[PDB]
Amino acid sequence: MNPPPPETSNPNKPKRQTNQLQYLLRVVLKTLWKHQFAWPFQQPVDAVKLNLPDYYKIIKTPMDMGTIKKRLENNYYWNAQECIQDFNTMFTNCYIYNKPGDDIVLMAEALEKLFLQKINELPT
Numbered sequence: 183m184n185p186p187p188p189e190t191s192n193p194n195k196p197k198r199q200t201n202q203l204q205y206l207l208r209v210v211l212k213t214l215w216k217h218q219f220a221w222p223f224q225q226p227v228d229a230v231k232l233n234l235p236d237y238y239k240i241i242k243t244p245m246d247m248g249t250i251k252k253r254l255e256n257n258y259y260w261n262a263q264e265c266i267q268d269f270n271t272m273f274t275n276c277y278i279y280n281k282p283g284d285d286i287v288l289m290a291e292a293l294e295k296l297f298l299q300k301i302n303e304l305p306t
């Protein structure tokens with residue numbers, strides 16, 4: 183009973199390439215993807231396989247880096263702020279579902295720390 187993944191392509195939306203969107207894919211997404219803690223965040227949470235039947239009762243705005251990767255590749259974002267919001271939704275989803283002190287929360291916290299470090303280098 184997993185939900186469908188978030189929408190990642192819409193051929194009717196307008197499309198543009200910007201230095202910030204390219205940076206978010208080539209640098210931010212790439213660096214986070216290759217991080218040693220990235221694996222639980224590289225795809226939608228599979229609540230069925232993981233036996234988490236309350237995940238999508240608690241998390242009603244799912245987000246993950248596999249979805250963000252597709253959105254960047256498909257020029258789904260017009261503004262860099264949309265992509266940054268998706269990353270933030272992704273981390274907060276982990277913090278909402280879990281509790282302070284859980285090992286999974288430590289992984290999310292490390293990735294978010296790296297994410298913010300790369301966002302500070304965002305080009306004008």
Ligand SMILES: Cc1cc(C)cc(Oc2nccc(-c3c(-c4ccc(I)cc4)ncn3[C@H]3CCN(CCN)C3)n2)c1
Pocket residue numbers: 221222223227228232234245246272273275276279280284285286
């Ligand atoms: C058994 C286990 C442990 C660990 C450390 C990872 C794991 O792999 C996995 N994969 C995908 C998602 C999760 C997950 C998440 C989560 C939520 C939103 C997002 I965006 C990304 C991850 N929150 C908790 N969990 C697991 C971890 C243990 N927890 C059970 C006891 N609390 C369920 N974990 C499996």
